Amino acid sequence: GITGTWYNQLGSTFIVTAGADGALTGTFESAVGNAESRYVLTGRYDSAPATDGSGTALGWTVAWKNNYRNAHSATTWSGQYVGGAEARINTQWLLTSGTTEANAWKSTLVGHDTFTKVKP
Amino acid sequence: AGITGTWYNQLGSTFIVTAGADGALTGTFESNAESRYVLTGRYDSAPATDGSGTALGWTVAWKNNYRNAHSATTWSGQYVGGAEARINTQWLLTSGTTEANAWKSTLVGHDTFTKV
Amino acid sequence: GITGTWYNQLGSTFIVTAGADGALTGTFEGNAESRYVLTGRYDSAPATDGSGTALGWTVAWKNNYRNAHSATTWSGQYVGGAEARINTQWLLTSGTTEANAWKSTLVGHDTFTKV
Amino acid sequence: GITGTWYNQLGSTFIVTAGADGALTGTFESAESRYVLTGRYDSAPATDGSGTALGWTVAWKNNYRNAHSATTWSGQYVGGAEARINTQWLLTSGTTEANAWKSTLVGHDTFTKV
């Protein structure tokens, strides 16, 4: 299932609980970036996925502020859980930083993260 | 913070959000009940003081008690205050797919929200 | 439709020719040092149902004066009419080490008009 | 290092020539499934361990088929014994204005020489 501890391809740690109501809650600890210790995440998932072989859609957000550091930025991951012998969460993400208007054209990074229950 | 309240895009969508003291975003995204969905996200509760906007993001899973599109959208963006306050976002909509169809699982776009 | 001089919302200038084969060629920039080659493709036989015309192009940010070790691609569609528009999304990738590849790519959106 | 034949994991192949002036020219085979490719690359990349920035476009029209769409790939070439082109891509379809909000898919793809 979705609930558990997952790792992306860089070794970041995603600790998430899927609630009966469609909620995602937990913590994220990034292996890269202007980031240290755990950050709060919240998100949503499809609690009644199709029964045709399709994955389970989900998304979550981290704002990169905790008690230690503040990078004035937020990542959102949008993707799907794919069950199976080696379960995976396949995502694309958008990181936006707060910027001045003059710098807004370069406010947003895009990437892709794949999560498994094994750490690199 | 200036975020709490009702925001509108230019395509007929509304949401309603509360920006908690703790960096939480909670609320609803709509157009009637069949068009309303739970939203949850996070924002920077201590933004820079150099004129920069406030980073934030949120998720809607497109499931409610009336329908289920087996999909989710995330909006990632920044709040800009002032005379003309705005939330400027880019978004990713992922649908559940089979692995054979995963290449076509995700739409990307942009949307700007205003208070009027 | 597509051939002409276009401007985005930040005042960049996109000078393009749409060839009979599907080719796009031109320059993206007022000074010489800020001018770069672009090349791309478009749908030379779009639908006849009111839909736009799909297209895309690339600029590598190297010219005879400057090199940013980066390239942008714009993907979008041409919408004709009294006020023609090209609506795009873009990806800017900079060369990075492997370790840094997660932060290689910016994304945005640009709208072009002939004014 | 870019000139030659590249493969993904989904059955696509392309052949490209990286010209001395920064041009990319070639053909992309999706699977009558061959299409013109054109783009640009950094002809004077750093030699510091960084990749070589590049991009290209395929409009999905040939003499047989037309999807009324175009993909752009933006990425970097990484050389060495196991060379790769790592990309993110945008596929835009021609749409009416009412449907423009759903005109563009996004994804990623990696190409190899083997």
Method: X-ray
D107 contacts B107? CB cut-off 8 A: no
Structure tokens at D75: 């990425």
CA–CA separation, A29 and A43 (whole Å): 16
CA–CA separation, B94 and B108 (whole Å): 9
Residue C4 to chain D, least CA–CA distance (Å): 20
* Neighbours, chain C (3 or more CB pairs < 8 A): A, B, D
D107 contacts B106? CB cut-off 8 A: yes
Beta carbons of B28 and B14 less than 8 angstroms apart: no
The dihedral of CA C48, C51, C52, C55: what is its sign? negative
Domain that holds residue D51: 1-114
CA–CA separation, C55 and C41 (whole Å): 6
CA–CA separation, A12 and A62 (whole Å): 13
CA–CA separation, B52 and B45 (whole Å): 13
Task: Please report residues of A whose CB lies closer than 8 A to that of D107.
Answer: 92, 112
Distances (CA, A) of C67 to B86, C71, D41: 35, 10, 11
Nearest to A111 by CA among C89, B109, D106: D106
Residue of A nearest to D90 (CA): A110
Helix (H, G, I), strand (E, B) or coil at B41: strand
The total number of structural domains that make up chain D: 1
Tell me how long chain D is.
114
Residue from D86, D106, D109, D110 whose CB has the most chain A CBs within 10 Å, to mutate: D106
What's the 3-state SS for chain A?
CCCEEEECCCCCEEEEEECCCCEEEEEEECCCCCCCCCEEEEEEECCCCCCCCCCEEEEEEEEEECCCCEEEEEEEEEEEEECCCCCEEEEEEEEEECCCCCCHHHCEEEEEEEEECCCC
Residues 13-32 of chain B whose Cβ lies under 8 A from any Cβ of chain A: 23-25
> Residue C100, class by beta-carbon neighbours within 10 Å (0-12 exposed, 13-18 middle, 19+ buried)?
middle
C50 contacts D72? CB cut-off 8 A: no
Residue of D nearest to C89 (CA): D90
Tell me how long chain C is.
115
C107 contacts A109? CB cut-off 8 A: yes
Structure tokens at D36: 């013109």
> What is the stated resolution of the deposited model, in angstroms?
1.1
What is the DSSP secondary structure assignment for residue A116, as one 8-state letter? B
Token pair 């020489």 is at which residue? D113
Residues 36-95 of chain C whose Cβ lies under 8 A from any Cβ of chain B: 89
Residue type, A66: N
Residues 6+ apart with CB under 8 A from B73: A59, A78, B59, B60, B62, B91, B92, B93, B94
Residue from C107, C109, C110, C111 whose CB has the most chain A CBs within 10 Å, to mutate: C107
CA–CA separation, A51 and A35 (whole Å): 38
Task: Please report residues of B whose CB lies closer than 8 A to that of A66.
Answer: none
Structure tokens at C44: 């030379």
A99 contacts B78? CB cut-off 8 A: yes
Beta carbons of B112 and B94 less than 8 angstroms apart: no
D76 contacts C92? CB cut-off 8 A: no
Specify the CATH number for the domain of residue B50. Answer: 2.40.128.30
Nearest to B77 by CA among B38, B30, B111, B31: B111
Residue C96 to chain D, least CA–CA distance (Å): 4
CA–CA separation, C60 and D14 (whole Å): 20
Strand B5-8 and strand B24-30: the pairing is unpaired
Residue of A nearest to C9 (CA): A105
Q: Extract the runs of DSSP E, i.e. beta strands, from B1-116.
A: 5-8, 14-19, 24-30, 37-43, 54-63, 68-80, 86-95, 106-114
Can you say how many angstroms the Cα of residue C62 is from the centroid of all Cα atoms in its chain? Answer: 15
Task: Please report residues of D whose CB lies closer than 8 A to that of A92.
Answer: 106-108
Residue D112 to chain B, least CA–CA distance (Å): 18
Task: Please report residues of C whose CB lies closer than 8 A to that of B90.
Answer: 107-109
**Which ranges of B38-101 does DSSP label H, i.e. alpha helix?**
none
Residue of A nearest to B94 (CA): A79
CA–CA separation, B62 and A37 (whole Å): 32
Residue from B104, B107, B111 whose CB has the most chain D CBs within 10 Å, to mutate: B107
Task: Please report residues of D whose CB lies closer than 8 A to that of A111.
Answer: 88
CA–CA separation, C61 and C25 (whole Å): 16
Phi/psi for A35 (5° steps) reads -150, 145
Q: Is B110 on the interface with C (CB under 8 A)?
A: yes
